[PDB]
Amino acid sequence: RRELHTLKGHVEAVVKLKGLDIETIQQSYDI
Amino acid sequence: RRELHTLKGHVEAVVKLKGLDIETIQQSYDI
Amino acid sequence: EENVYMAKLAEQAERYEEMVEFMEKVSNSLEELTVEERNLLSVAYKNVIGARRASWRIISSIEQKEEHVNSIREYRSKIENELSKICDGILKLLDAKLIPSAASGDSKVFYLKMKGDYHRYLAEFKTGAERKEAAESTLTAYKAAQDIATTELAPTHPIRLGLALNFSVFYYEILNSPDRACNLAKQAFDEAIAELDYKDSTLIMQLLRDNLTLWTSD
Amino acid sequence: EENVYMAKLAEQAERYEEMVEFMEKVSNSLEELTVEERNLLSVAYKNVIGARRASWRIISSIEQKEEHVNSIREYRSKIENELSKICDGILKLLDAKLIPSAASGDSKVFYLKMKGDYHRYLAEFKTGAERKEAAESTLTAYKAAQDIATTELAPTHPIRLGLALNFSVFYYEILNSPDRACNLAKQAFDEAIAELDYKDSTLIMQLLRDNLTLWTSD
Numbered sequence A, B: 001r002r003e004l005h006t007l008k009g010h011v012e013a014v015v016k017l018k019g020l021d022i023e024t025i026q027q028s029y030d031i
Numbered sequence C, D: 001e002e003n004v005y006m007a008k009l010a011e012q013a014e015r016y017e018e019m020v021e022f023m024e025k026v027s028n029s030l031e032e033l034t035v036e037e038r039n040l041l042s043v044a045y046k047n048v049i050g051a052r053r054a055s056w057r058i059i060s061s062i063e064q065k066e067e068h069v070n071s072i073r074e075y076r077s078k079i080e081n082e083l084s085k086i087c088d089g090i091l092k093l094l095d096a097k098l099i100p101s102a103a104s105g106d107s108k109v110f111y112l113k114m115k116g117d118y119h120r121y122l123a124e125f126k127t128g129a130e131r132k133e134a135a136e137s138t139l140t141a142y143k144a145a146q147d148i149a150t151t152e153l154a155p156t157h158p159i160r161l162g163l164a165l166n167f168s169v170f171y172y173e174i175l176n177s178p179d180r181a182c183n184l185a186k187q188a189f190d191e192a193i194a195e196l197d198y199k200d201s202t203l204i205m206q207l208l209r210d211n212l213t214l215w216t217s218d
């Protein structure tokens, strides 16, 4: 639901996936 | 992996999600 | 009725830009946009702008690891321009057809909120007069939504609640004043609690909670 | 080196069409395309055509529930045209630059397989001379891949194995002769087993197995 309904959730899925070594980008949850 | 790496997996995720009442489309697994 | 229909196909297909087009057409054609219509339209823009915001965050982050930088920076540019275009697209439409005709509490808050969110997306990436004028437009759309919401909608209502959620992210992230963020968040959470006696609301109350524990922990 | 770089950004961003563009440029610029390059290029087309194939299946299915039908049918049309364009895009490129220069077993099988897959995508939706000529082109690309693969690659090799997997879906689905499908699948599975003494291969062996139990159960 958080990965479906929120940018922050989505963006985290995507970067866990991409194997991205980059340090954490900063976001909160918005609708 | 099957939903990431295959069309059939992907298409199933997507239609489980969309709430799609439609009867099952026919596919096998390809790479 | 057709373009709505067409809207749901594009949505079934995950071809969201086309979903936008259809939904734009839908509104011009129209009088009072319906709950179904207003939601489709919003979902469509939600997804089209959403994909750009995601790619923008992932690239900015890459740009950060890197300090190439100017490739990345040209690229971000192009994504930045797509952003202005969509926000542009749906903002105009909000003045012209959408807001002016709003007949009810929810509807005005709904639209006034969208307006806030879209200036809010201009604000995340613009840098000049544009950032400033976007930060302001944002504050003032949210605020008038707030005045109506907090007075005509139940604290438990998905709209009152989503407004507060986005409103306080604006503070936290755009104005960069935490304090104002946590208080608005906390406040909106507590009076939903006062009245818990479902399901779009429930999610949103948890997102407020997660934002607070995250803003508290810096 | 740059356009490759640019390729990985587009990929990080999930802007796959742009990934295609970059990767096209990359190949013309170039001599022997590298393993990294060949993979990026393929991933890019994989995703761009993949999104169309998905939307196409979801809409065809909708069209089926429905017998509107002609809206849906115009829409499918437009998606169908996008399909020809991408397959078109990467097919040409395969004759011109890709296949001709292949220096090794894997590389020829890799490319001959792509060629097979892309005519295969033309075949799933074309209807005329085009379906026929696509079914044929397909059979013959797979077959020459097969002849090399089955003779120079280990049965356990991701390429030998992915070829067999797609090759038999062609039979099952395009030519519509199951028998030939299960035998090719079964055969490719068993002699990977004969030699199991990892990880792209492992997946693929399971996809063969799942296809068989699914083709057996009709």
Ligand SMILES: CC(C)C[C@H](NC(=O)[C@H](O)[C@H](N)Cc1ccccc1)C(=O)O
Binding pocket: A003, A004, A005, A006, A007, A010, A031, C042, C043, C046, C047, C050, C051, C054, C200
């Ligand atoms: C619960 C709702 C208010 C959120 C809901 N969003 C949707 O239906 C969208 O398809 C995605 N969930 C949001 C999205 C888009 C792109 C990237 C990440 C997440 C909406 O617009 O109403």
Ligand SMILES: CC(C)C[C@H](NC(=O)[C@H](O)[C@H](N)Cc1ccccc1)C(=O)O
Binding pocket: B003, B004, B005, B006, B007, B010, B031, D042, D043, D046, D047, D050, D051, D054, D200
């Ligand atoms: C294991 C590999 C051979 C499969 C791999 N595919 C990829 O990396 C793609 O990003 C998606 N996984 C495939 C996809 C695209 C669109 C829809 C559904 C699935 C590849 O091209 O090598």
